């Protein structure tokens, strides 16, 4: 290739998008933006494929160009815009607010929130540095550059951002005993309390996380997102509450449902 690529094939698209084989040869290639190509949900696959407000890709454009969808408080008319983890989608015409939160199976969930909860979001801390004339600067997982933060905030922490002003209202440090969600790997979508962190200098750290039912797993430190302080999350949680059911337990829980029906 002599330059950057502009297409995406449907079998090469991220599996959690849940795209079928026989609709087309191509998939929406996400625009460049705050979230990565393989860790985002474009607006077309959310308005058309998940919410079914539109039947074709031309109808998504007609909804978008009417300026109905706000991503974290700003109107986006791009139909392949890379929305991602912890983002807030607001449709004012129907009065709906959604937050992009992984479910236990590793896929983005349709998680509706209240108008009050849509006024803030939680952001991980990626980089801290000092810029010209000694001004501290943050860089988050949302590609947000926030200057003059508290000196107690360090890398791998979580901050709360008010979407109207874009300023930090509170923060949670990274330490054992704090709630977290896994945002990658094989435990994606799982919620649990940090119990240990083993350090491997010159390589990747490992964090051990225990569920509410007593199941323990481990992840790389880059795949951990601190949610709340202690056992209490700072955001509303999806239906599964982060607990991964086994296939036998899931089978029994599904079979018990149809017996209830009658």
């Amino acid at each position: 290739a002599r330059g950057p690529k502009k297409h995406l094939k449907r079998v090469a698209a991220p599996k959690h998008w849940m795209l079928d084989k026989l609709t087309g040869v191509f998939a929406p290639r996400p625009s460049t933006g705050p979230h990565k190509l393989r860790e985002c949900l474009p607006l077309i696959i959310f308005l058309r494929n998940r919410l079914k407000y539109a039947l074709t890709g031309d109808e998504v454009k007609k909804i978008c160009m009417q300026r109905f969808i706000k991503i974290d408080g700003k109107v986006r008319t791009d139909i392949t815009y890379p929305a991602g983890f912890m983002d807030v989608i607001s449709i004012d015409k129907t009065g709906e607010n959604f937050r992009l939160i992984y479910d236990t199976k590793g896929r983005f969930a349709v998680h509706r929130i209240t108008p009050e909860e849509a006024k803030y979001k939680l952001c991980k801390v990626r980089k801290i540095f000092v810029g010209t004339k000694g001004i501290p600067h943050l860089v988050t997982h949302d590609a947000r550059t926030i200057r003059y933060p508290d000196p107690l905030i360090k890398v791998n922490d979580t901050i709360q951002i008010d979407l109207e002003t874009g300023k930090i209202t509170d923060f949670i440090k990274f330490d054992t005993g704090n709630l977290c969600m896994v945002t990658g790997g094989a435990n994606l979508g799982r919620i649990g309390v940090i119990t240990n962190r083993e350090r491997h200098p010159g390589s990747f750290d490992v964090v051990h996380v225990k569920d509410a039912n007593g199941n323990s797993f481990a992840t790389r430190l880059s795949n951990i997102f601190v949610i709340g302080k202690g056992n209490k999350p700072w955001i509303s949680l999806p239906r599964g509450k982060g607990i991964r059911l086994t296939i036998a337990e899931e089978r029994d829980k599904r079979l018990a449902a149809k017996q209830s029906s009658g």
Binding site: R147, Y148, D150, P151, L152
Partner: peptide
């Protein structure tokens, strides 16, 4: 904007520097 944001961190930097010196002065004797 610059002079309102620069004058608020200076007030919040003083508190964080002051609370971080008690933690040192107390520990030296103990």
């Amino acid at each position: 904007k610059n002079k309102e944001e620069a004058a608020e961190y200076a007030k919040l930097l003083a508190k964080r520097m002051k609370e971080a010196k008690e933690k040192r002065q107390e520990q030296i004797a103990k």
